[PDB]
Amino acid sequence: SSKVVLSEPRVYAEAQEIADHLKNRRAVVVNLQRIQHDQAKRIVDFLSGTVYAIGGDIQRIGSDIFLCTPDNVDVSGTIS
Amino acid sequence: SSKVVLSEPRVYAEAQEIADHLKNRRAVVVNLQRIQHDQAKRIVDFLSGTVYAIGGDIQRIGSDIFLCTPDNVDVSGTI
């Protein structure tokens, strides 16, 4: 019924695919633990701009991993 | 609208609170980065039994981090 996408991007360009998911109202788990760190930063910044624009959110869920949500997904709880 | 719960348990007994969320049709992200490693294992095994019982799923989504879902959440892609 609801859909969550798991994403492990290799290059900065793959952020566009993630943003398309968000625009289509799906949450996306973004694992950046195994990407070049300079590229990870770029992804996160791009996705911050995406979510800012569509009224969603982006939240760190662990070391170099994030949950991006559209406005139709409420997230509760926190991770240190 | 849907709800996703973020959990960072510190003791094994908190796996019950995660299981309650799943029985109530919410996905839970379970970050086991801060718990003792021996106890992480035991949480992950407890949750596999829970999801087995209710027809959901458990998927590793990074180091020491898992996505548990009930049957009403479809997960696509992999990590």
mmCIF file of C-alpha atoms in Angstrom:
data_model
loop_
_atom_site.group_PDB
_atom_site.id
_atom_site.type_symbol
_atom_site.label_atom_id
_atom_site.label_comp_id
_atom_site.label_asym_id
_atom_site.label_seq_id
_atom_site.Cartn_x
_atom_site.Cartn_y
_atom_site.Cartn_z
ATOM 1 C CA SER A 1 0.000 0.000 0.000
ATOM 2 C CA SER A 2 2.616 2.729 0.852
ATOM 3 C CA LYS A 3 6.014 2.369 -0.910
ATOM 4 C CA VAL A 4 9.577 2.893 0.356
ATOM 5 C CA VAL A 5 12.536 2.928 -2.085
ATOM 6 C CA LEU A 6 15.999 1.848 -1.077
ATOM 7 C CA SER A 7 18.761 3.725 -2.858
ATOM 8 C CA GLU A 8 22.506 3.372 -2.869
ATOM 9 C CA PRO A 9 23.680 5.927 -5.412
ATOM 10 C CA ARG A 10 27.139 5.695 -7.017
ATOM 11 C CA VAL A 11 27.365 9.133 -8.626
ATOM 12 C CA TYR A 12 25.897 12.546 -7.989
ATOM 13 C CA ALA A 13 23.669 12.266 -11.123
ATOM 14 C CA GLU A 14 21.612 9.496 -9.435
ATOM 15 C CA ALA A 15 20.144 12.120 -7.051
ATOM 16 C CA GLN A 16 17.780 13.006 -9.889
ATOM 17 C CA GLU A 17 16.187 9.479 -9.734
ATOM 18 C CA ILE A 18 15.754 9.917 -5.955
ATOM 19 C CA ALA A 19 14.110 13.310 -6.476
ATOM 20 C CA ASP A 20 11.737 11.739 -9.040
ATOM 21 C CA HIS A 21 10.657 9.232 -6.400
ATOM 22 C CA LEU A 22 10.041 11.991 -3.896
ATOM 23 C CA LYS A 23 8.029 13.980 -6.464
ATOM 24 C CA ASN A 24 5.929 10.877 -6.946
ATOM 25 C CA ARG A 25 5.179 10.760 -3.213
ATOM 26 C CA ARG A 26 7.501 7.924 -2.183
ATOM 27 C CA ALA A 27 9.933 7.870 0.771
ATOM 28 C CA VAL A 28 13.477 6.980 -0.076
ATOM 29 C CA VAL A 29 16.186 5.542 2.040
ATOM 30 C CA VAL A 30 19.523 6.897 0.800
ATOM 31 C CA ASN A 31 22.592 4.915 1.824
ATOM 32 C CA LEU A 32 25.824 6.854 1.151
ATOM 33 C CA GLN A 33 28.173 4.690 3.275
ATOM 34 C CA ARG A 34 30.060 3.342 0.220
ATOM 35 C CA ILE A 35 30.181 6.383 -2.104
ATOM 36 C CA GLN A 36 33.152 8.827 -2.333
ATOM 37 C CA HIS A 37 32.549 11.190 0.584
ATOM 38 C CA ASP A 38 32.782 14.332 -1.601
ATOM 39 C CA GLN A 39 30.045 12.941 -3.778
ATOM 40 C CA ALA A 40 27.863 12.026 -0.731
ATOM 41 C CA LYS A 41 27.914 15.675 0.396
ATOM 42 C CA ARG A 42 26.764 16.726 -3.012
ATOM 43 C CA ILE A 43 23.901 14.291 -2.990
ATOM 44 C CA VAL A 44 22.695 15.362 0.412
ATOM 45 C CA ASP A 45 22.812 19.035 -0.581
ATOM 46 C CA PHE A 46 20.949 18.382 -3.806
ATOM 47 C CA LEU A 47 18.289 16.380 -1.956
ATOM 48 C CA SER A 48 17.961 19.061 0.705
ATOM 49 C CA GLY A 49 17.049 21.502 -2.097
ATOM 50 C CA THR A 50 14.644 19.012 -3.582
ATOM 51 C CA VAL A 51 12.832 18.364 -0.324
ATOM 52 C CA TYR A 52 12.810 22.067 0.577
ATOM 53 C CA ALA A 53 11.082 22.742 -2.744
ATOM 54 C CA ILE A 54 8.399 20.038 -2.429
ATOM 55 C CA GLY A 55 7.708 20.473 1.270
ATOM 56 C CA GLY A 56 9.274 17.159 2.298
ATOM 57 C CA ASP A 57 12.060 16.343 4.728
ATOM 58 C CA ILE A 58 15.501 14.837 4.858
ATOM 59 C CA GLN A 59 16.801 13.313 8.086
ATOM 60 C CA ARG A 60 20.022 11.486 9.048
ATOM 61 C CA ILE A 61 19.106 7.911 10.164
ATOM 62 C CA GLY A 62 22.642 6.702 10.842
ATOM 63 C CA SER A 63 26.216 7.122 9.643
ATOM 64 C CA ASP A 64 26.019 8.426 6.045
ATOM 65 C CA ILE A 65 22.455 7.257 5.681
ATOM 66 C CA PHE A 66 19.319 9.414 5.290
ATOM 67 C CA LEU A 67 15.611 9.115 4.955
ATOM 68 C CA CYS A 68 14.024 11.506 2.427
ATOM 69 C CA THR A 69 10.274 11.895 2.714
ATOM 70 C CA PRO A 70 7.628 13.697 0.668
ATOM 71 C CA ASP A 71 4.976 15.777 2.533
ATOM 72 C CA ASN A 72 2.608 12.806 2.747
ATOM 73 C CA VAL A 73 4.991 10.800 5.058
ATOM 74 C CA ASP A 74 5.229 11.754 8.735
ATOM 75 C CA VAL A 75 8.397 10.622 10.510
ATOM 76 C CA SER A 76 8.416 10.171 14.292
ATOM 77 C CA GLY A 77 11.283 9.468 16.665
ATOM 78 C CA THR A 78 14.937 10.457 16.504
ATOM 79 C CA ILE A 79 18.384 8.992 15.916
ATOM 80 C CA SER A 80 21.429 10.512 17.680
ATOM 81 C CA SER B 1 -0.630 9.944 4.666
ATOM 82 C CA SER B 2 1.769 7.327 6.217
ATOM 83 C CA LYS B 3 3.968 7.177 9.342
ATOM 84 C CA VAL B 4 7.531 5.865 9.613
ATOM 85 C CA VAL B 5 9.069 5.388 13.039
ATOM 86 C CA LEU B 6 12.787 5.899 13.767
ATOM 87 C CA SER B 7 14.117 3.757 16.641
ATOM 88 C CA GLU B 8 17.570 3.549 18.212
ATOM 89 C CA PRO B 9 17.117 0.917 20.857
ATOM 90 C CA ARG B 10 19.493 0.661 23.865
ATOM 91 C CA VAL B 11 18.247 -2.607 25.366
ATOM 92 C CA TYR B 12 16.850 -5.861 23.942
ATOM 93 C CA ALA B 13 13.451 -5.238 25.562
ATOM 94 C CA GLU B 14 12.875 -2.252 23.277
ATOM 95 C CA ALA B 15 12.393 -4.743 20.381
ATOM 96 C CA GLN B 16 8.847 -5.152 21.818
ATOM 97 C CA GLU B 17 8.090 -1.469 21.225
ATOM 98 C CA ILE B 18 9.290 -1.877 17.587
ATOM 99 C CA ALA B 19 7.106 -5.008 17.220
ATOM 100 C CA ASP B 20 4.130 -3.043 18.520
ATOM 101 C CA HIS B 21 4.660 -0.398 15.779
ATOM 102 C CA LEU B 22 4.760 -3.151 13.136
ATOM 103 C CA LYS B 23 1.571 -4.769 14.403
ATOM 104 C CA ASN B 24 0.052 -1.297 14.077
ATOM 105 C CA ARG B 25 1.003 -1.098 10.356
ATOM 106 C CA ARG B 26 3.957 1.306 10.605
ATOM 107 C CA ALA B 27 7.425 0.831 9.051
ATOM 108 C CA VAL B 28 10.265 1.243 11.536
ATOM 109 C CA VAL B 29 13.878 2.141 10.869
ATOM 110 C CA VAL B 30 15.991 0.400 13.504
ATOM 111 C CA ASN B 31 19.414 1.894 13.994
ATOM 112 C CA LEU B 32 21.583 -0.441 16.127
ATOM 113 C CA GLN B 33 24.735 1.737 16.085
ATOM 114 C CA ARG B 34 24.589 2.630 19.722
ATOM 115 C CA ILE B 35 23.666 -0.727 21.376
ATOM 116 C CA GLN B 36 26.255 -3.421 22.462
ATOM 117 C CA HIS B 37 26.882 -5.673 19.437
ATOM 118 C CA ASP B 38 25.839 -8.908 21.162
ATOM 119 C CA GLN B 39 22.459 -7.279 21.975
ATOM 120 C CA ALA B 40 21.979 -5.956 18.382
ATOM 121 C CA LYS B 41 21.962 -9.479 17.129
ATOM 122 C CA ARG B 42 19.333 -10.513 19.573
ATOM 123 C CA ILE B 43 17.093 -7.525 18.515
ATOM 124 C CA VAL B 44 17.469 -8.445 14.856
ATOM 125 C CA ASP B 45 16.543 -12.100 15.547
ATOM 126 C CA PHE B 46 13.498 -11.087 17.705
ATOM 127 C CA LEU B 47 12.311 -8.788 14.899
ATOM 128 C CA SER B 48 12.756 -11.482 12.216
ATOM 129 C CA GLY B 49 10.424 -13.700 14.295
ATOM 130 C CA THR B 50 7.980 -10.845 14.676
ATOM 131 C CA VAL B 51 7.844 -10.065 10.973
ATOM 132 C CA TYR B 52 7.701 -13.774 10.079
ATOM 133 C CA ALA B 53 4.609 -13.993 12.278
ATOM 134 C CA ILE B 54 2.782 -10.959 10.886
ATOM 135 C CA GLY B 55 3.790 -11.245 7.212
ATOM 136 C CA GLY B 56 6.131 -8.214 6.997
ATOM 137 C CA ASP B 57 9.833 -8.008 6.207
ATOM 138 C CA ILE B 58 13.196 -7.017 7.689
ATOM 139 C CA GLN B 59 15.979 -5.642 5.414
ATOM 140 C CA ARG B 60 19.483 -4.452 6.272
ATOM 141 C CA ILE B 61 19.766 -0.900 4.930
ATOM 142 C CA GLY B 62 23.325 -0.100 6.045
ATOM 143 C CA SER B 63 25.809 -1.039 8.779
ATOM 144 C CA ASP B 64 23.914 -1.903 11.922
ATOM 145 C CA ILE B 65 20.693 -0.456 10.396
ATOM 146 C CA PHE B 66 17.512 -2.180 9.415
ATOM 147 C CA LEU B 67 14.172 -1.415 7.862
ATOM 148 C CA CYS B 68 11.268 -3.394 9.286
ATOM 149 C CA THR B 69 8.013 -3.262 7.430
ATOM 150 C CA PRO B 70 4.543 -4.671 7.876
ATOM 151 C CA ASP B 71 2.742 -6.232 4.909
ATOM 152 C CA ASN B 72 1.132 -2.917 3.919
ATOM 153 C CA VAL B 73 4.524 -1.288 3.091
ATOM 154 C CA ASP B 74 6.125 -2.335 -0.190
ATOM 155 C CA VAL B 75 9.926 -1.893 -0.303
ATOM 156 C CA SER B 76 11.713 -1.637 -3.681
ATOM 157 C CA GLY B 77 15.391 -1.410 -4.726
ATOM 158 C CA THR B 78 18.212 -2.866 -2.673
ATOM 159 C CA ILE B 79 21.361 -1.918 -0.825
#
